[PDB]
């Protein structure tokens, strides 16, 4: 699983819980929208 | 309904209430003007 379209609109906390459940090793980075990466 | 020109100038709270009434599933994202999407 590489994408989480079910998380659009949800909080960071709920996104993190869902991602770590699907992907235990995930390194979760939180950035404002529009941030150049 | 895809657009809400009646909400220009209104608060986020009033925009949200109106949008969710017209579109129950809406996932409401709030960004500063000028944000690149």
């Amino acid at each position: 699983k590489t994408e989480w379209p079910e998380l659009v609109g949800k909080s960071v906390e709920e996104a993190k819980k869902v991602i770590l459940q699907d992907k235990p090793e995930a390194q979760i980075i939180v950035l404002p929208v529009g941030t150049i990466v | 309904k895809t657009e809400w020109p009646e909400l220009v100038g209104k608060s986020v709270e009033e925009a949200k209430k109106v949008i969710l009434q017209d579109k129950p599933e809406a996932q409401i994202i709030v960004l500063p003007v000028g944000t690149i999407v």
Binding site: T2, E3, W4, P5, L7, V8, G9, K10, S11, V12, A15, K16, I19, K23, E25, A26, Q27, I28, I29, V30, L31, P32, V33, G34, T35, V37 | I29, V30, L31, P32, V37
Partner: peptide, 23 residues
């Protein structure tokens, strides 16, 4: 492209604004 990383792009209320993807 980093397979263990997941970026969360958040709005002004810290809600997820875009679909999260590995990378």
């Amino acid at each position: 492209y980093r397979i263990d990383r997941v970026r969360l792009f958040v709005d002004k209320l810290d809600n997820i604004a875009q679909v999260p993807r590995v990378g």
